[model samples]
Target: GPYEATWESTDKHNAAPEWYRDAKFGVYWHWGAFTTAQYASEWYPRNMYEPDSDQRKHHTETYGPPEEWGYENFIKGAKDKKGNFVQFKPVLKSKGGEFDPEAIIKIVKGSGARFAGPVAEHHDGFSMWDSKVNEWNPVNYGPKLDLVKLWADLVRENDMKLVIAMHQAYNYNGFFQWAPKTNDTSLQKLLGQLPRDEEDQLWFDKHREMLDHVQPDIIWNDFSLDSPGECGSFEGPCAVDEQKRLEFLAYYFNRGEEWGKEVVTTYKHHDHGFRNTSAVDDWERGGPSNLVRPYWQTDDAISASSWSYTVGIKYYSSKAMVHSLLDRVSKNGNMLLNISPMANGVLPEEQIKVLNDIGDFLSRYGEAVYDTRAWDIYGEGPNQVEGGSFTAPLQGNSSDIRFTRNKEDDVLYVTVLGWPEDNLVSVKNLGSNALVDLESLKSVELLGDKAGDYVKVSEWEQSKDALDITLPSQPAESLAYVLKLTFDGGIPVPQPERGAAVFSKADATGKGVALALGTFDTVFLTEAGLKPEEIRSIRVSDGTKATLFSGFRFTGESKELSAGEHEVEDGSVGSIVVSKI
Candidate 1:
């Protein structure tokens, strides 16, 4: 079956498809058995399994040791010494309760995310959907409803792409390694006590069930897919067989092909090789800091405390979340925000408020983000974010700003993190005396409302220094402001000359001229790779004085031209020619 399909290179995989590159924003929910206890995270079970772990210690202090009371007791509802069931269980009303999938969908839609969905399975071996393959599922036991189906229907109804998060493959393999085993056969099986071969088959069967039922557009997984010589088997090999994983991907992609739909598969290891089907996911807190060429996504939760529903967890401010989204978008990555739902299917009030704030910000400035690309450079500011996974996102100061451009090629947007009291903002990147002409600059306006309303801009003069521009007296609103710069023939592409070259047309050999240029000056001479001695007479063409003097030079009359402003129109002057002296 693997041979039936063609394999591509990883370099090709690095190239982001046009569709994903354009779909800049998406959202997904992460809730599971972890929500049942609302403990640290899904890791609560495993941690509780390991002796001396925080979960284990807490379990001992609050209730008792695992040897005295096993994990299965929590399933039927474990009671404390005082007779209080510490495990999470909320009764759902027939009419409506806290966990309303429709209401959550509405909140996600308002956040300006083009795609929204839920985590179908987590590491706790619990499936959000009704599963015939896996007995432990939301529909069959926990929630008593097909959670994935509910999410899929609501997402499609709202015209949003559906994404399914699956992190259960690692459960039997090593995620549950710390949990204590039970002598009772039923409980042992429930806690993943099957043989290696049978467990592998079960893993494959569960994935098949998910694919057949939900048909998710994106399937995001966590680490540990690289089990040795095994297709995610609990015993035997330490990593997953590469061939088997590929087989699974081929099957998934084939299904998408048959349905005429675009699908995405992601992994956390190098075992998958360089296939276009796989996307890299940054867990709770991770993502590249700069503009990564290959379209990527970072899955993060709203709360700093836990990924699942906890009784009392501190939440990140809405402003912080919104600003982080903007920063991620500027770096060409999508933010998959995780919302933890309580047992009764209710979202917390604080969480709803954060989502609302994000939605409000997007409603005001969605144009700058929805379908944009990274600019020539990401942005210039004091905040220097590291370009690596697992890096925490920090809010850039008021002086910090990020940049992104529309794919249409007509507009360049400069996003200021905080509005400055002074309306004047100077951009240093546009500071080439010859490369950019300020007079040809038409108008600069804010993203929302009419061109004449809240924002205005006028390009003054350009020198070897920065390009100076003036803004409107007052801004309509403030958060992150976008300055739209429209040019006559789109933005001019900068020439690629980094140094100076000299050439001579007088000699028959045509190699009699010498040339010299300064730093950052790009020159095009009649000859290729011209040295200074070969140049005849040099005329400074299209670079700044500082840049021209930094490189080699040719014999010519160096005249200090009058300090005057030049407006760029069409294919004007930005080049210099050297002739035989």
Candidate 2:
């Protein structure tokens, strides 16, 4: 059945699929007409119109004033004051050009990314595909080629998922807001200053073609998707053509269901709003501080400075970059690392080094990452990461720890960001209190410096406060160390120490439908594939109170459980109703 084009109906569709969850990490780009500027970041189009802005100054200094040479010149191929031609066109290698989609994929694959693709259409409003929606496309101009089609085929041929990112929705919202009104039809269209209804229809039609025909596994869009009206017919905030957004999702989801493929869509900030759960939440460059509820994602860039290629763009160190991935994965979020390629289609050397360094980390210790789920507490220690978006890539210290477990949740892998000296390391999550949470832990081993290798600890002690282990005389290389604890069975569920926590699986595996102080129902838990009354253990965090009833609502057998761990033999939590105070 086709999903109704309503949030009420479409929100029921799955957001993140198992393949994406298992993949843990991905790669994306921020290139297009803007990369041709190769001066500032991808914002060259918008900033060039801003008064007194650095980009504006640079634009005039490089080319002429926006009056004489505007963004149109790039598309039409204009010569700068230095007689250098400025254009965003790239010729395909097959036509004896440099932009080889195949070369791009090889780098993506070699970097250990499971999936990769390009930003099919950016805010520039130029379609990279053979579009029926508009004539402003790569197909009709210099080095004419369907970049999207080329990228899609090559990515799939390399056995990687394709992620098509669309920023065209916000093209007119504020992207090109500063540009002066133009009389040229092409410039008016490119600047997204056309008739409100006409532009809305064009936006809808363009996305419809991409989703229905391109059939991408992941449709990643940049903000402003929550409205169903024109984004901005005049000025201030206006609703989007939301009618079109739903129709697009309905068609995409229905087609995915037909093909038996999992499709995911992402929206940012208030674009999808709190009431709308039809799409996934995407942080620009950072994730939440702790274990975030409802799976989330962060789309970050490799360069700490700019999102697009520019001269002398500084890069974040591999240590900071790789550790950020570890931090996000531990927080139950995935990282989509973006790399900027020059207009010539070649990635800069610094970006390649970061990719290679990350590849080395994942390729070696991926067992702790790939196919693993976030642990109850998202690891312990200091060096806290902030919430929200666009945080600097943090290089954690020796004390910061992150936790992940295998699918079954029997083996817990604890990763410490830095090496512990004095040949000693203690894991607080597995302190003496935690041993009781497990059913007789079997053995302890650290993932060796190399892949598929390990070093069995000759000496170790388990105590209520900590699990102590002697490190090898020599410290391990790379960013973090994973201490693998093999239990006789599933990991022991931690009795809630402070906040409300639930366990759907007997041993605290899965999300556990964690709760906040208030109220809940069996129906509430089950809505997300969570089992009801299946909570074997409940943690009553200090100061918080809870009640569990056997029946729907507050009816049936009930008992008030207050702050502390309530495990088996404590009493029957047998009920679906829950109240937190």
Candidate 3:
């Protein structure tokens, strides 16, 4: 079926496919002409144009005035005030240069990343590919290498999905607002100082060209995708207008169908330019506090200092990266880890070490991380990863345990962040009285020092309070440990009582329904397998309240259930909303 340039048509397409859901981890980098600045973050192009920014002062001292030197000089090559040549070109090792695209791909693959690629176009407005729409591109200036094409080839050859990040959505919006207006046409295009209509056309044209060229599996977008107006279309400062945005979505979806492939588009803003049903939501450096439905992703960097390489870039430890990956995967999300490469196209030793460390861990216990679904609960521990974007990479101690189950629904993998003391562990979620059936348990073993190596558990006990296991004196992995439990039958669906539970019978007896944290309108109530006005008993979680509405959309009379079981009228609840007390 062909998709039309409308929300209704685009919404029919799948946002996260089975492949993306199972891949679990990917790797990408912020390497481009901007890395040449090597002073601040990737915003060096915009920051240097600011009136009194440190980047501006540094630019004036290192090269010349912003107007005199300009960012164009970086791509076209220039001489500093000290008579030293500077440019964004990185010669490949085959030609006796530092950049080795194949080596980078291998390193990324070794990190257990199922998908990998480059940031094809960033806010700097320089296209990494050979572009016919925009003359200011890698083939026309820096390196003379079609980086996106090169990366796509290498990534495909390595049996990985290709991810092309497009951050140019914000370029025409306000990325270059600080830059002084230019007179030269080509320079003006490079600086994103063209007419509003021309810039918007360029944005759409670039995406169209990219889709035709490499045909990326995932087109990752940065923020400001929703701009200029309060709704889908309006008049005011606009980047890529709503019409172009919708057309791009329709074009991508149609292309994917023609190619017999599943495609995904990601955005940072929630329900802004793209709705949650149409596109996957991407968190920059963090994720939610608990399990999230619809499968999302987070893009975090190995170095916290800058997305691109800079002097004295500080990197988070490999443990932090691995732990964060485990945490995110357990919460029904994927992690796209970023590495910073030097201006000369050399991946720093520190960054590579972090990747290898993560690779080593995943190599041993990847069965627990990849190709698994989140269990009823994300994890049970004292340390909660602070939710929201820009939060630091969080670390879990020995006591923290994350849960994932195989697609077959016959095996459960429990991962401990670190080895607990005394070689004894208690799993609170697996207590005898929990909703899961303990009688169906088959066998439990610890994942050994290598892949497919399982150590038989000699002693363990399942009690009413918890599932306690006495581990061997020696540990299997340095960073974390995995316990694989193979069940005789399907893993029992543990009912989540966190939000609230509704029952069709009074005294909480029959047809119980678990309501996750969200409003359930009449239609949603029906989708949850409940009949109209059928809810008769409700059990609310601690510190939470559940409101039963008599009419649709929370209208008419309402009764509130708070932190306890309540028997209600047999046919009264038309809608429901659960929230924290």
lDDT (tens digit, per residue) of candidate 2 on 75-167: 778999899887878877777877776877888887788778889888887877888777778778655878888888888888888898888
In the range 1-581, model 1's lDDT, one tens digit per residue, is 22222354222232235565566668786665666656676567767768578888877776678677655555456787667865434444445555567778888898777777888877667666788877776565644678788789989999887778877656667767766766765555556667656665665677678987988777776655663554333454444445445555666666766767767766553333324334454423545555543456776668877777777777877766776777777766777787777755788888888888777777777777777876545565786556544434556655676777776655777777767666655665555632444444566776554233445564445556555556665456656677787766555332112222222332212332212232111222211133333344322334422111223232233323212222222222233432221
TM-score of 2: 0.88
Residues forming the 10-long window of minimal summed lDDT in candidate 1: 562-571
- Mind giving the per-residue lDDT tens digits that candidate 3 earns over 474-511? 65557889989888866644434457777778886565
List all candidate RMSDs to the true structure: 10.1, 4.2, 3.7
**Among all candidates shown, the one with the greatest TM-score:** 3
| Candidate 3 regions with alpha-carbon error over 4 angstroms | 227-239, 432-437, 462-465, 493-498, 501-544, 548-559, 562-576
lDDT of 1 at 556: 34
lDDT of each: 0.60, 0.75, 0.83
For candidate 1, the TM-score is 0.77
